[PDB]
């Protein structure tokens, strides 16, 4: 069903867990079949599981961790702060991001927006 | 002008500074005259400076602090994680919140959404 506030916290925490281990298939399955992703927020969105799988396969040796609690609403939405550690061309770097997600009545991510830019990168 | 990513970080950091000291008039002036606020996200929005001033005067002895860096995009938007400390009826409590803001071409907050619920309260 439409995830409650407590359920949204668990779903979003799980999402970061999946990104951390790099299980591309488990990540893609968390999204609705026609979900849209705007990463970073400001650029045109990618639509559907095929494009999303390509996005995550391309983006993912990356370690991600929640840097604060998941903020959840009562209308199936949530927002969370986290850090992504990568090694950009031999040189290691970190990226601070905030993801905003809206879930559907099946508990899947319907839309996702990622807030970050070069100001949040540390290389 | 439409704030750059670096400018959005400064504006949002300033906003928390104002909430922390409790300068209601300086806070209200940061919003556009017809801005909308959804706090908490999920409830109907308040529109305009009059209603917003009433909201902040009612809500504000409160101390707020950024708990992580401001995430900013290139389209005049940003998101930030912070904690609000209040003393609910003699008993002290904290609230973890994430604010998402969109600025206009004048550098004022056009819309603001606050993500939090009872799951983010510690009393």
mmCIF file with all atom_site columns, C-alpha atoms in Angstrom, chain A residues 5-6 9 41-42 67 69-75 77-83 96-102 113 115-120, chain B residues 5-6 9 41-42 67 69-75 77-83 96-102 113 115-120:
data_model
loop_
_atom_site.group_PDB
_atom_site.id
_atom_site.type_symbol
_atom_site.label_atom_id
_atom_site.label_alt_id
_atom_site.label_comp_id
_atom_site.label_asym_id
_atom_site.label_entity_id
_atom_site.label_seq_id
_atom_site.pdbx_PDB_ins_code
_atom_site.Cartn_x
_atom_site.Cartn_y
_atom_site.Cartn_z
_atom_site.occupancy
_atom_site.B_iso_or_equiv
_atom_site.pdbx_formal_charge
_atom_site.auth_seq_id
_atom_site.auth_comp_id
_atom_site.auth_asym_id
_atom_site.auth_atom_id
_atom_site.pdbx_PDB_model_num
ATOM 1  C CA . UNK A 1 5   ? 5.894  7.513  7.318   1.00 0.00 ? 5   UNK A CA 1
ATOM 2  C CA . UNK A 1 6   ? 7.614  4.640  9.167   1.00 0.00 ? 6   UNK A CA 1
ATOM 3  C CA . UNK A 1 9   ? 12.015 5.518  6.336   1.00 0.00 ? 9   UNK A CA 1
ATOM 4  C CA . UNK A 1 41  ? 17.817 17.913 -10.264 1.00 0.00 ? 41  UNK A CA 1
ATOM 5  C CA . UNK A 1 42  ? 17.855 20.515 -13.037 1.00 0.00 ? 42  UNK A CA 1
ATOM 6  C CA . UNK A 1 67  ? 24.497 11.007 6.910   1.00 0.00 ? 67  UNK A CA 1
ATOM 7  C CA . UNK A 1 69  ? 17.805 10.404 9.427   1.00 0.00 ? 69  UNK A CA 1
ATOM 8  C CA . UNK A 1 70  ? 15.233 9.941  6.674   1.00 0.00 ? 70  UNK A CA 1
ATOM 9  C CA . UNK A 1 71  ? 12.595 12.690 6.766   1.00 0.00 ? 71  UNK A CA 1
ATOM 10 C CA . UNK A 1 72  ? 9.222  11.237 5.860   1.00 0.00 ? 72  UNK A CA 1
ATOM 11 C CA . UNK A 1 73  ? 5.782  12.718 5.251   1.00 0.00 ? 73  UNK A CA 1
ATOM 12 C CA . UNK A 1 74  ? 2.320  11.155 5.443   1.00 0.00 ? 74  UNK A CA 1
ATOM 13 C CA . UNK A 1 75  ? 1.654  11.283 1.707   1.00 0.00 ? 75  UNK A CA 1
ATOM 14 C CA . UNK A 1 77  ? 7.130  11.018 0.287   1.00 0.00 ? 77  UNK A CA 1
ATOM 15 C CA . UNK A 1 78  ? 10.501 11.335 1.934   1.00 0.00 ? 78  UNK A CA 1
ATOM 16 C CA . UNK A 1 79  ? 13.855 13.061 1.771   1.00 0.00 ? 79  UNK A CA 1
ATOM 17 C CA . UNK A 1 80  ? 17.244 11.901 2.959   1.00 0.00 ? 80  UNK A CA 1
ATOM 18 C CA . UNK A 1 81  ? 20.799 13.251 3.279   1.00 0.00 ? 81  UNK A CA 1
ATOM 19 C CA . UNK A 1 82  ? 23.712 11.043 2.238   1.00 0.00 ? 82  UNK A CA 1
ATOM 20 C CA . UNK A 1 83  ? 27.290 10.914 1.016   1.00 0.00 ? 83  UNK A CA 1
ATOM 21 C CA . UNK A 1 96  ? 26.946 15.202 -0.617  1.00 0.00 ? 96  UNK A CA 1
ATOM 22 C CA . UNK A 1 97  ? 23.435 14.599 -1.929  1.00 0.00 ? 97  UNK A CA 1
ATOM 23 C CA . UNK A 1 98  ? 19.818 14.862 -0.830  1.00 0.00 ? 98  UNK A CA 1
ATOM 24 C CA . UNK A 1 99  ? 17.284 12.576 -2.495  1.00 0.00 ? 99  UNK A CA 1
ATOM 25 C CA . UNK A 1 100 ? 13.567 13.377 -2.533  1.00 0.00 ? 100 UNK A CA 1
ATOM 26 C CA . UNK A 1 101 ? 11.312 10.410 -3.357  1.00 0.00 ? 101 UNK A CA 1
ATOM 27 C CA . UNK A 1 102 ? 7.613  9.865  -3.936  1.00 0.00 ? 102 UNK A CA 1
ATOM 28 C CA . UNK A 1 113 ? 14.956 14.009 -7.487  1.00 0.00 ? 113 UNK A CA 1
ATOM 29 C CA . UNK A 1 115 ? 19.891 17.660 -5.207  1.00 0.00 ? 115 UNK A CA 1
ATOM 30 C CA . UNK A 1 116 ? 23.604 18.299 -5.689  1.00 0.00 ? 116 UNK A CA 1
ATOM 31 C CA . UNK A 1 117 ? 26.039 20.165 -7.949  1.00 0.00 ? 117 UNK A CA 1
ATOM 32 C CA . UNK A 1 118 ? 29.788 20.905 -8.085  1.00 0.00 ? 118 UNK A CA 1
ATOM 33 C CA . UNK A 1 119 ? 29.433 22.860 -4.828  1.00 0.00 ? 119 UNK A CA 1
ATOM 34 C CA . UNK A 1 120 ? 28.781 19.543 -3.079  1.00 0.00 ? 120 UNK A CA 1
ATOM 35 C CA . UNK B 2 5   ? 24.433 27.265 -6.875  1.00 0.00 ? 5   UNK B CA 1
ATOM 36 C CA . UNK B 2 6   ? 26.935 29.108 -4.643  1.00 0.00 ? 6   UNK B CA 1
ATOM 37 C CA . UNK B 2 9   ? 23.989 27.874 -0.406  1.00 0.00 ? 9   UNK B CA 1
ATOM 38 C CA . UNK B 2 41  ? 4.878  18.729 3.330   1.00 0.00 ? 41  UNK B CA 1
ATOM 39 C CA . UNK B 2 42  ? 1.552  16.929 2.926   1.00 0.00 ? 42  UNK B CA 1
ATOM 40 C CA . UNK B 2 67  ? 23.241 19.521 10.360  1.00 0.00 ? 67  UNK B CA 1
ATOM 41 C CA . UNK B 2 69  ? 25.808 21.131 3.856   1.00 0.00 ? 69  UNK B CA 1
ATOM 42 C CA . UNK B 2 70  ? 23.244 22.848 1.646   1.00 0.00 ? 70  UNK B CA 1
ATOM 43 C CA . UNK B 2 71  ? 22.651 20.888 -1.569  1.00 0.00 ? 71  UNK B CA 1
ATOM 44 C CA . UNK B 2 72  ? 22.118 23.294 -4.438  1.00 0.00 ? 72  UNK B CA 1
ATOM 45 C CA . UNK B 2 73  ? 21.154 22.889 -8.085  1.00 0.00 ? 73  UNK B CA 1
ATOM 46 C CA . UNK B 2 74  ? 21.712 25.160 -11.084 1.00 0.00 ? 74  UNK B CA 1
ATOM 47 C CA . UNK B 2 75  ? 18.056 26.087 -11.525 1.00 0.00 ? 75  UNK B CA 1
ATOM 48 C CA . UNK B 2 77  ? 16.762 25.332 -6.064  1.00 0.00 ? 77  UNK B CA 1
ATOM 49 C CA . UNK B 2 78  ? 18.292 23.818 -2.974  1.00 0.00 ? 78  UNK B CA 1
ATOM 50 C CA . UNK B 2 79  ? 17.721 21.413 -0.121  1.00 0.00 ? 79  UNK B CA 1
ATOM 51 C CA . UNK B 2 80  ? 19.168 21.392 3.365   1.00 0.00 ? 80  UNK B CA 1
ATOM 52 C CA . UNK B 2 81  ? 19.160 19.177 6.473   1.00 0.00 ? 81  UNK B CA 1
ATOM 53 C CA . UNK B 2 82  ? 18.700 20.785 9.885   1.00 0.00 ? 82  UNK B CA 1
ATOM 54 C CA . UNK B 2 83  ? 17.558 20.319 13.461  1.00 0.00 ? 83  UNK B CA 1
ATOM 55 C CA . UNK B 2 96  ? 14.923 16.758 12.216  1.00 0.00 ? 96  UNK B CA 1
ATOM 56 C CA . UNK B 2 97  ? 13.788 18.496 9.037   1.00 0.00 ? 97  UNK B CA 1
ATOM 57 C CA . UNK B 2 98  ? 14.778 18.874 5.399   1.00 0.00 ? 98  UNK B CA 1
ATOM 58 C CA . UNK B 2 99  ? 13.715 22.038 3.588   1.00 0.00 ? 99  UNK B CA 1
ATOM 59 C CA . UNK B 2 100 ? 13.470 22.205 -0.203  1.00 0.00 ? 100 UNK B CA 1
ATOM 60 C CA . UNK B 2 101 ? 13.391 25.741 -1.635  1.00 0.00 ? 101 UNK B CA 1
ATOM 61 C CA . UNK B 2 102 ? 12.952 27.297 -5.056  1.00 0.00 ? 102 UNK B CA 1
ATOM 62 C CA . UNK B 2 113 ? 8.517  22.443 1.305   1.00 0.00 ? 113 UNK B CA 1
ATOM 63 C CA . UNK B 2 115 ? 9.849  17.262 5.083   1.00 0.00 ? 115 UNK B CA 1
ATOM 64 C CA . UNK B 2 116 ? 9.237  15.866 8.562   1.00 0.00 ? 116 UNK B CA 1
ATOM 65 C CA . UNK B 2 117 ? 6.597  14.050 10.623  1.00 0.00 ? 117 UNK B CA 1
ATOM 66 C CA . UNK B 2 118 ? 6.295  12.469 14.091  1.00 0.00 ? 118 UNK B CA 1
ATOM 67 C CA . UNK B 2 119 ? 8.973  9.946  13.079  1.00 0.00 ? 119 UNK B CA 1
ATOM 68 C CA . UNK B 2 120 ? 11.479 12.811 13.122  1.00 0.00 ? 120 UNK B CA 1
#
